[PDB]
Design an enzyme around this catalytic site. Structure first.
Site, PDB file in Angstrom:
ATOM      1  CG  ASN A  79      -2.022   1.017   1.101  1.00  0.00           C
ATOM      2  OD1 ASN A  79      -2.505   1.320   0.069  1.00  0.00           O
ATOM      3  ND2 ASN A  79      -2.402   1.535   2.215  1.00  0.00           N
ATOM      4  CE  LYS A  92      -4.480   3.329  -8.969  1.00  0.00           C
ATOM      5  NZ  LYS A  92      -3.482   2.787  -9.888  1.00  0.00           N
ATOM      6  CG  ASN A 216       1.078  -5.068  -6.706  1.00  0.00           C
ATOM      7  OD1 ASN A 216       1.256  -5.333  -7.856  1.00  0.00           O
ATOM      8  ND2 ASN A 216       2.056  -4.863  -5.891  1.00  0.00           N
ATOM      9  N   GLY A 217      -1.959  -3.847  -3.481  1.00  0.00           N
ATOM     10  CA  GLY A 217      -3.173  -3.252  -3.000  1.00  0.00           C
ATOM     11  C   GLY A 217      -3.985  -2.742  -4.138  1.00  0.00           C
ATOM     12  CE  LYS A 377      -0.506  -0.015 -13.377  1.00  0.00           C
ATOM     13  NZ  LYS A 377      -0.837   0.371 -11.983  1.00  0.00           N
TER      14      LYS A 377
END
Length: 485
Positions: A79, A92, A216-217, A377
């Protein structure tokens, strides 16, 4: 190790100690420093590796682990990142993805679901950076009070920072103008260091936790799969990396590879060979070798960053290395101020989380469907997720609506107006169009959706005057058409 360090190295140690960077991090960094001082550039050329031919696949698996395994499972989410590519000055993970929920909402809900349905002891951890910590904590405090109560003591893992070092000397860079620029995160491989340094790995192991799922968070796809745990139990895997097939759009991203170790005998009488998997990212690849790096047929496996770790093995391994995981160094060439090209030239030392695949005797990789690597993205991605092309599961997972048939709507958004979040929000300010029954939507110029817009087939909304906003009306149903003023 002990000094017995060079003067440059000692200066690094001194600066970190003063700062007061964690000792595990100092030990880890210094070992990297020594390598670099002995000539290691971190390069991995094609001659040094072989491609991976085949791997097991998730699709083969049917057996699900039982509750008891989940009871010994830790979910860790990375994170550290900001939403910067999308204009978002926040973690994010705090970007709203669907139905007014963030990535973090979904993860927290998934965890709660597992706790409620399988295992109250399943643990949740966040790896935060200094940039994201306060905001994450405040978000929990508001929305997930149970996490918040344990945040400082249980949930949060802090990322370290390490000094940039001058290229000629390996001594710490100085930038009087901005002293923060002297520092950098180390990057993703730091998780092991942080976990060790904090005392958390030891704590987790002693409490009887056996598995960690790290991801990945910002990957919506990264959800606990019970099959994977069962597989790990069964095959006695210590480190497992999930990979996807590398597509053209990933050709500039990290691939799996292998090396061999031939152990001659050696009084056994049998010559043995072991396969070693490793990760290679582009920064490790020489220019000469880059086109090959970009051959998706040849190197076809892309690291997702969904990693499964057997915690006691990791701890034992770290202990046997002086409380470190000696991941291969990536030695980036930079300037102390990246934007200013006359600043002193520096090396930024980093490691990859994925690169841990090389450190364990029982490591493997498993091919997983692309749905397990689902980052956002672009605001174009966000549009698809916010739409009804996606549904939320009973267990708080996001998946394509059946009517999609495994095919998302393709969303093309003008990067003149929608690259950033403020621009994107404006486009959807009166609602999110129904994209489920839509193959492609392209938006050119400045547009606003109406409420209750439904798009079918292929749609383009083009406004060619940049001093205007083209507003679609409520109820609009647009099918296989181009709309324009």
């Amino acid at each position: 190790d002990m000094k017995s360090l060079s003067a440059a190295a000692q200066a690094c140690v001194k600066k970190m100690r003063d700062a007061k960077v964690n000792e595990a991090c100092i030990r880890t960094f210094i070992a990297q420093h020594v390598m670099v001082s002995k000539g290691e550039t971190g390069s991995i050329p094609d001659s040094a590796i072989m491609p991976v031919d085949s791997l097991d696949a998730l699709d083969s698996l049917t057996i699900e682990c039982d509750n008891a395994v989940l009871q010994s499972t830790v979910v860790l989410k990375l994170n550290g990142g900001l939403g910067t590519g999308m204009g978002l000055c926040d973690a994010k993970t705090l970007l709203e993805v669907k139905d007014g929920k963030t990535f973090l909402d979904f993860t927290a809900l998934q965890v709660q679901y597992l706790r409620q349905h399988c295992s109250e002891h399943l643990r949740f951890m966040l790896m935060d950076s200094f940039n994201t910590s306060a905001s994450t904590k405040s978000f929990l405090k508001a929305r997930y009070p149970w996490l918040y109560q344990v945040f400082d003591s249980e949930v949060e893992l802090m990322q370290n920072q390490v000094p940039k070092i001058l290229q000629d000397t390996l001594e710490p860079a100085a930038w009087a103008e901005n002293p923060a620029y002297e520092w950098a995160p180390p990057g993703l491989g730091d998780i092991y260091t942080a976990l060790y340094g904090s005392g958390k790995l030891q704590e987790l192991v002693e409490q009887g936790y056996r598995y960690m799922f790290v991801s990945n968070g910002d990957n919506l796809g990264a959800t606990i799969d019970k099959r994977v745990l069962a597989y790990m139990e069964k095959e006695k895997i210590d480190f497992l990396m999930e990979v996807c097939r590398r597509t053209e759009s990933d050709k500039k991203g990290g691939h799996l590879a292998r090396q061999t170790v031939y152990v001659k005998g050696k009084d056994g009488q049998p010559d043995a060979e072991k396969r070693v998997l490793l990760l290679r990212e582009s920064a490790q690849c020489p220019k000469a070798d880059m086109e090959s790096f970009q051959d998706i047929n040849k190197y076809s496996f892309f690291n997702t960053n969904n990693l499964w770790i057997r915690l006691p093995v990791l701890l034992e391994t770290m202990q046997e290395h002086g409380g470190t995981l000696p991941l291969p160094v990536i030695r980036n060439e930079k300037t102390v101020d990246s934007s200013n090209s006359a600043s002193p030239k520096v090396y930024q030392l980093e490691t990859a989380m994925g690169a841990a695949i090389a450190m364990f005797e029982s490591a493997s990789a498993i091919v997983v469907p692309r749905s397990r690597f689902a980052p956002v993205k672009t605001c174009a991605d966000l549009l698809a997720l916010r739409s009804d092309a996606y549904v939320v599961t009973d267990d708080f997972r996001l998946v394509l609506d059946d009517r999609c048939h495994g095919h998302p709507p393709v969303v093309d958004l003008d990067s003149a107006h929608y690259k950033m979040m403020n621009g994107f929000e404006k486009l959807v300010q009166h609602g999110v169009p129904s994209l489920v029954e839509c193959k492609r939507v392209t938006v050119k110029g400045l547009v606003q959706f109406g409420a209750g817009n439904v798009l079918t087939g292929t749609v383009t909304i083009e406004n060619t005057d940049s001093a205007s906003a083209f507003v679609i009306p409520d109820g609009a149903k647009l099918n296989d058409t181009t709309a324009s003023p």
